Each structure stands twice: as C-alpha cells, then as structure tokens.
C-alpha cells in the first residue's frame, strides 16, 4: 500500500503476509457473506491497484464470482474511459499521464505509475477508484448468492423474537435493497412476518416504536 | 486510526489485520458479554469514524443488536444536530466545516474530513464522540441480552460463598444498574441472597464489612 | 502506554491487541496463580491508568476478586487523598493539577490529564502509582484463593524430595508470608515436614545447608 | 528485500520469518494451484535475487517442478546474455558492472552487487527481472500439472449452473490459454458444455449476455 | 530491554508479550533441558535486571529450582559486594551510585537506576552481570536434574551408532563436565561404550579419528 | 543481527523471538532435510557470530550432528588461523584487532568486538564467514543422513513419471554431488532408471531434451 511513513511523506510499502493471509482466510471461511466486503475494504486500506489485483488473484476457487467481478470491473473501466478520454501529448517532466480505465484496474499500468498517481499533488486515487469498482462487483455477488428472500423470513410460532430478528436483518443485509425499502422494514415486514402472539403485542405498541421497544415487548 | 508517529505529528494509519481479527473473534466467542465493551474501546484506540464503522460492519450475525446499535447512533446524531446546528458559509482556507451528526457517524463524511477534524488545533474528536455513541448503544444491548435478574441470584445451601459472589457481580455487571443501587449491593442483596448459614455469619459481622471480610467469614 | 519513541520524547501509544489478548488469556488459564502478578506487571509496562482499567475490565468472570480489587483501589485512593489534599486554585498555563485518588485510578481523569502527569517534568507517575495499588489488591486475592497452608505440605513416605520441595515453595509463594518467616522456611518447615528417611539425612547435614545441598542429600 | 525506509532511501532488509513461513506453507497446502503464483509475487515484493532463490530453495519436495523451474531460469538467463553482452572494462568508481544472466538469477552475483543494481540511479531491477523469469517457469508448471482439460468440463444434468461455472473457470485458469480463446469462453464453451435444460435457456438469452445474466437465467 | 533505537541512542523499551510468552512456553515444554539456557539468554537480549526478574518470576511451578536459583544469585551478589564495596558520599549531578549486589539483582534498585547504569558512559552492564549470575544458577539446575550419567550411556547390541551418539552427547551436555573431560570423550568413552561390533571397527580406525569418520565406519 | 536502521547506520538488534522459534521448529519438523539449510541461512540474515551460536545451541537433540558441526567449525577456524596469523601489537584507538578462528566462531570474542568487525569500514564480515563454516558443516550432515543413493532411485513399472522424478531429484539433492555429475543426471540416470515403457519413449526423444519435454512424453 501507499502509506505515510513516520516523516510525513507518502511512500510505498509491500503488502504484508498478515494482510495476504487474512484476506485468503476470510474468503475460505465466509465466502461472500455481507460482512466480507467491509473486511476487504479494511484489509485493502491504502492499497494500490496492484495490491487490489493481488488480493483478488490470491483467491482460489469461487471463479464464477471472480469472473463476474472482472466483468463489473471492465464495465466501470469502460464508463471511466467514456467520461475521461485521455488527451494525447508528451507528458511534462513533473506530471503524470491521464489514467485509462485499464490503468486504474492495474492491468495496463505499472506500480511506479500507480505510485505516481496516488502520490501526486493533487493525487489521482486510482486505488480508491478501483476499490469502488471492486466493492460494487462484490456487492452484486452477495445479492446473487443470497439464498433466501426477505419475504420468506417469518417468525416461528415458538421461535423467540430475538432469533427471528437476527434472521430478518441477516437476510435483508444480503439482499441489499434500497434505503427506502430497508428503513421501513422495521415498521412493515418485521411486524407482518412475526408470529400471531408477537404481532398482536406489536400492534398495540403503535407506530414509531424502536427495535429496542419491539424486542422488549415480545420477550 | 489517527496515531502520533515517532516524530510528534498526528497522522493516519490503516487499521491492522490484528485489530480487525481480534474484534471479530471476541464477538464470535463472547457475543455481548459485559467485558466485550472495554475490549471494543481498547481495540478502537484512536479510531476514526471510518474505523469504528469498519469494526461494526465486519461483524456477521447478531444483526438484531447491530440494528439496535444503529438506532442509538441515529438518536445521538440527532441530539448532536439539535445542540450543534451547522452554520452555512464558505469554509476558510485553513479551517474545517462543522460536523453534522451523520458526519461523526462516518456516513456522510470522508476520511480526509475525519482526519481534518481529529488533527485540527483545537481538535474535534469525532472518533471519540462516535465511540461514546457506540458504547452507549452497546451497553443497552448488554442489558437487554442479560438473561438473569440480580434478585434471582441466591446462594445455594451447599454452594461456596466464593462461587455465589462470582455469579452475583457477574449478573449485576450485565444489569448495569445505577451507582447508588450497585454500591449498596454489598451490604444489601449480597447478604440477603446468601444461604442461612452464611447469612447468620454475615449478620454477626456487622455493617461496613468489606467484601474481603465477608468472603473470609463464609469460608 | 506512554512510551519513548525513537526520538527521545515520551508519547502515547494505543495498547496493542497482543497485549490485550495476552492478559485475557493468562487470566483464563491461570486465574490468580502467583505468577500471574509479574505477568500483569510486565504486560502493563508503561501503562496509563486508562490502560490499567482496560486490562482489569476486559476480564470476564472472577468478579468476586475483581470487586475485592476495587475496594483495595478505593482504600489506597482514600489514603492518597489523606496524604495529598489538592490545593484549590487556577492551574498555571504550563502546569498540571494535583491528581486526586480517583484521578490516579483513571475514573475521574482523562487520558490527556494522565499523559500530562506521566510526561511532566518532573513526572507524576500515576500509572505506576495505580499499578502499585492494583498489585497490592491482586496479592490479597492470591492469598485468599490459596487453598493449602504451608503447614499441611508434608513429604510423602515414597515421594521424591524434589517433588516435595516443588509443592513446598509453590504453596509458600501463594501464602506470601513475611520475609523472616519465608527465609527460615529452608531451615525450619522444609526439614520438619520431610519424611523420616530424608529428615534423618538433613539432620546429619547440619544447619546452614543450601537447598542444593539438601536436595542432593535426599536424592 | 530492498525497501524504502521511513526516510526516503532504498535500503536492504532481511527477509522476515513471517515471509519465509508463509511461502513454505502455501506450497505445502496448495502445491502449484494457479492462485499460488500471485501469492509468490506478493510475498516476494521488493525481493532481491538472493531472496527469490531463498524462497525457491526453502521448498522441500516438488523437485521435478523445481528443476523444471531451473531450466526455464537458465533459458531466460541465456536469452538475457544474448540481448545484453557485457562490455569488458574497469568499472567506474561510482558505477555498476553490467549483470549477466546468472547475475540476475543470483547465482554468480553477491548481495552487495544486487543491492547496487536495484538501488542504482537509474536502477537495474534484477529482482523484478528474475521474478519475471520465475513466474514464467511457475506458470508452465501450473499448466503441466493441470489434470483436466477445459473440453471435459461439462455441466451435470442435475448440477447447479453455479457449481459448473466454478469448475469451468477453475480449469480454464490452470490451462492458461490465450486471451482470445479465454475471452470467448463465456459465449462458446460455457454454453456448449452446459446441460440441455440450461443450454436451452442460454440460447434464448441471445449473444452478448453477461455471466451475471447467464447465471441468473439458469438458477 | 535497553535497546538502541533507530537514531543511535540507548533507550528503554517494554518487554514484549511475544518475549514474555516465549519464555513461559519453553519452560512449560522443555523444563530445564540444556537448550533452554541459550534460549533464555537470547530472549533476555539487552534485558534490564527488572526484565530478568520478570522472566524468572513469570514461571509458575519448578519452585525448587527457582529457589535454588535465588541462592546462587545471592551468593554471587555477596561476592560482588566483597569485591566492590560501595563508597559513601553524595553522587555527582551527572554520575551514578555504585551498584550493590542486590542492586544488580534488581531487588534494591529502580528501573531508572538500572537504565542509568546500563546507559552510562562508560556503562555498568548490570543486566549482563545479573544474567551471568542467573545462567550460572540455571546451569547448576541442569546438572542436578540430569537423570543419567555419561558412564551409563552404552550402545545397544543392535542400536545404530547414530542413535547411540545422539544419546551420548545429549547426556554429556546435561552433565556439563570440564573441557578436558568433554573434549576427550570422542576418543575415550564414546568408543569404550560402543557395542563390540562397532568398537572393533573404531579400534582399527586408529586414534585421532573425527566423529564424522567414526559414524561413517559404524554405519 | 547487525541491521541498517531507518537512518543509514549499521546497528545491532536483538534476535527476535519469531526468529528463535522459527529455527527451533524447522529442526524439530524437518531435521536435516536439504531445504533446512536455506532456511537457516535466511533466518540468520545479518546474524552475528553470537546469533549463529545461539541458533545452533537452542537446538535440543541431534547432538551427534551438532558435534560434527563443531568439528567442521574448528577445522575451518584452524584453516583461518593458518591463512591469517594475528600480528601482535597495540590496537590503534580507532581500529579493531585481527580476528582469530575462534573469534569468528564467537567463542573467544565479545559481541562488542563482533559489532566492531561487522560495522568496520571496510568491514570484516565475521558473521558471514562463520555462516559459511556452519553451512559447510551442515551440508556434510545432510549427505551423511541421506538414506538412499541416487543409483537406487528407479521408476516403478506402474509409477507415474512425475512421482519418480520427484523422488529422483529429492534424493540427488541430499547427495549433493558435483556439478558435472548433477547436470548430466537429466540425460543419464533419469532415463536409465525409468521403467521400460517410459525409457522407450525417452529414447525416441533424442538427446538434449528438456525435463519439461521428458515429463510430457511419459505422461
Ligand atoms: Cl506480517
Ligand atoms: Cl476459497
Ligand atoms: Cl464496504
Ligand atoms: Cl507518466
Ligand atoms: Cl431480547
Ligand atoms: Cl498486523
Ligand atoms: Cl458473530
Ligand atoms: Cl468501556
Ligand atoms: Cl472542510
Ligand atoms: Cl474465598
Ligand atoms: Cl499487535
Ligand atoms: Cl476469565
Ligand atoms: Cl510483581
Ligand atoms: Cl490540568
Ligand atoms: Cl534433585
Ligand atoms: Cl516476523
Ligand atoms: Cl512442499
Ligand atoms: Cl502473478
Ligand atoms: Cl560492480
Ligand atoms: Cl447463482
Ligand atoms: Cl508482541
Ligand atoms: Cl512451568
Ligand atoms: Cl548460554
Ligand atoms: Cl544514582
Ligand atoms: Cl550416520
Ligand atoms: Cl517477535
Ligand atoms: Cl530437535
Ligand atoms: Cl544455503
Ligand atoms: Cl579490539
Ligand atoms: Cl507431468
């Protein structure tokens, strides 16, 4: 990654074996669960496009998802080239060439060029731009591999309300619905999909009840 | 986190894989036991709002609690906006804009802005302010998930007084009662809920006896 | 902890996940064995009062001992206030306020104030003062939880003298007797509690024999 | 490796025990799977030719592949000598001698000479040149040890399309075919080798369908 | 330990949790085998007397040996006081007081005083002096706990000569005999204690044969 | 080891617990396999003679080999003294005394003297000179403990050619034959010791075939 050393200058460091192993293990253990994406974003803190390609390519298996990830990366790279056409001309002695879509993806750019963009003033954060493309493609993989729909998450007649809400927002997180549909899930599906005994209690609670108040009422 | 390097300047460092893994493991092993909160506060030492959101979002499962945590965060963010209304106007070339409630929660603020507030002179510690909101919501989760009331912790007729006091303050810690009710628990419930043999000995001890004196007397 | 960086200035560092995990594990594995106290003192090297409270509060269970530890801390804090009454008045622009007993315990003082005392010239080592209070309370827990008295440690008729001396000083260490009673344990109880065959040999050795000479004679 | 320290100067560091152990373990666990090559490239970040020879020589077993790796290294070293014949003459007091093919492979060059080339201005990156030779030979080992041909990867009549695509691109990755043959694998073999039910659905999808659209259609 | 930082000045660092755990584990696993002593010397590199007492006191059990270690430390401390009687008088503003025997053992000296002696110019290496006393006492424990004498290590009639020499020098190492008795062990006891078949071959080899030549001859 | 810090000056660092443990473990797991020697050379990067003696002495067991290692060290030390007789005379205030053979082995030299030679200008690399002696003795141990001769490595009638070549160069590596005998092993013994079916195919391949071509032909 490109990290600021203990002197105030942005320099390159090699990706650590701890970072490499941590990313491989979480994919082996959790696959494409929703919480893997924030783990990927944190383990790739300050990562160059080369570091991002390293983390992706060190993953063995799940190649169906890894190839869906490449298509999303190519789609975003093509959109970047449509919005940022590179202007031909010799690069000034102290400047950097404009990055193409494949340059941000680390496939047509060298590490020195990636360091040059990320450490420029003002900097071109090709690592963070590439990471946005990767996380976008990873989120589509999480939704595709989500097995259960939120409509099928219903509380059992003897299931504790706490365990049911655990399954509810676990499923809703993988579905990655819109903000409007997710915010009202507390007042709509969570009450509708509860068992008759708890739904009766939640009805007498009235609208605008917090999740803490709803879980307390059905305990 | 924002850490002072070995030169006296506050700079940003990426959250370490050791920190990321340590927080995920303690939640997998201890869930929301009371001692998880001081572990979260220590692992998030100097953490930015982005680091705090990272630690929370890397947690898979327990989504009922994680969503109760979001509501507490939104409640505190709304209270911050009520007490600190942002004043409109162009930001001076060397100053920072006033953070909104969602800016402290890391949802509407960039890392550069969070670094700008935390490294300002005087600094706006949005990371520590956000951590106060998170710990507040985490403490409410510990109380809700506390299974046993302190009134039901009674010493068995053959249970050693040491094991009974272990269960007593373990339950009392999760209940997180007031300081007045918790301080007098030594002289009130701890003696009342003891078995007849030890309660007789603790009665002859008289008021004002230390826990060391009470445990010694019933050994 | 407050550590001297690689430039000669005392600055604050966050407590490491390795330090946090090491202290939690040794309590889970060894509880309050005598050797846990030097491990606590080493793991808390240069620790601030906040770091000390962190290590104590991350311990789940053993709450009977942890509450006995709080009473010892409060007793020492009250003794500190009796010997150091804070003088009222505005603090000079470059000075620090006098710490109260609860300030050294980290309950009424901020981290910045603890850094201010520990890095002062001359420094007020509130971390080492607090650690003395904690170790004092921890030593009382080791004695209370010591199951066997030194008077009951006797060598078996067929027990090797080496194993008996292992049990002897293991028990004596947890008892934490006075220096006078512990120094003469070599010449008094260790010989008296040996089996008849080894006691006969140790009698012919004469007074002033080293433990190496006594163990060799009964081999 | 040759790493830039926290002062802006390229200096040598010893290869860490974490790096040494991580490379030995991944070979013990994954042998010559395709994802081992990006792991080798990352673990050898900034590595000198001596570090590269160290990582290769610490591998016990797989000596058939390790000897095939030596022949590829010798072939590339001979090609380097054909394109870069060293010019005889005394080296200037501040310059470096031209590296031979065996000098880049670390067999006829000292560490000081490798540091001299890598830290030169302009630098001769003998470590990255050697790594290109090693990765080239490692890729030939991956293809040779690939057990299954892509033509034999066909979807079962009841096999889910997701698992079939997992096996498809896993096999195709080890085959390491040309870019033209690999890019069209989505529109050609992946549909041809699917079961009759999914092939019918993929036919009605039409050409130019993304892998995300194809996997969704056969779910 | 007192380590030279990355600026050329000798400063104090806290003993690491890795060092603390490594010393406790090797004692739990190997007890007082001969190879534990060089491990103790390496783990205590640059250690202060406080660090040395920390490592010794973190050891639970083996208290018979740990108390024999204290007597050896007191014997050496008394010998130091006999050779270095402290001269009374006020210490100059830039000097250090002469260390007593108990000051080197870390029992009557503070860490600041130990840092003052070790970082003095010229330095008083109280840590290395104390370590010599500890290693001296540890070596006496290794000899006492050595179960087998070198005279009883004889090669079996069917035992391979390699395994017999393994047992020979393993026993001889724990005995820690004199240099004269240990150097000639190759030409004396190693041949005398071999089986009749190998002793016949070693006799025809003649004097002055290396261990490599002796092991080859009896293979 | 003597490592260049982050300021361009060669200073001493204590050998890390990770380095100490890594060397002990690889000897416990792999003994004296050929790949242990490059692991020893890497773990001892920049090691002083004291660090080298530390790594050797921390090895418990295998004392037959460890004593054969001492004789090789003494042989090389005697050869060093024969080629470098120390010249008597007082050492200049800024110079270092000439190292004897036992000084390079770390037995008659202090750490300060070893630092003085290694950090001299020009430096006397006593650590690398000692390491050459150790690796020389370690290689003789690998050959002695090699159980199988290369002449006895023959391909089974149903053994895959890949597994046979694995056993071939594994045995040849431990034998550590000459370069001339090892280079022609591809064209001589590897074909001669193959089964009749593969030997027939390798005969029709003709001379000068690469190992990749030979393994492909017998697959
Ligand atoms: Cl690492
Ligand atoms: Cl995987
Ligand atoms: Cl994310
Ligand atoms: Cl450019
Ligand atoms: Cl609940
Ligand atoms: Cl880490
Ligand atoms: Cl979890
Ligand atoms: Cl807390
Ligand atoms: Cl701003
Ligand atoms: Cl008790
Ligand atoms: Cl850590
Ligand atoms: Cl515990
Ligand atoms: Cl202590
Ligand atoms: Cl103040
Ligand atoms: Cl004994
Ligand atoms: Cl390491
Ligand atoms: Cl292997
Ligand atoms: Cl690669
Ligand atoms: Cl040169
Ligand atoms: Cl799917
Ligand atoms: Cl550590
Ligand atoms: Cl132990
Ligand atoms: Cl030693
Ligand atoms: Cl003094
Ligand atoms: Cl042998
Ligand atoms: Cl370490
Ligand atoms: Cl071993
Ligand atoms: Cl080597
Ligand atoms: Cl000298
Ligand atoms: Cl093959």
PDB file of C-alpha atoms and ligand atoms in Angstrom, chain A residues 18, chain B residues 16-18, ligand 6:
ATOM      1  CA  UNK A  18      -0.561 -10.898   7.547  1.00  0.00           C
TER       2      UNK A  18
ATOM      3  CA  UNK B  16      -4.228  -3.514  11.331  1.00  0.00           C
ATOM      4  CA  UNK B  17      -5.300  -7.065  10.426  1.00  0.00           C
ATOM      5  CA  UNK B  18      -4.567  -7.974  14.049  1.00  0.00           C
TER       6      UNK B  18
HETATM    7 CL1  LIG G   6      -0.950  -6.997  11.817  1.00  0.00          CL
END
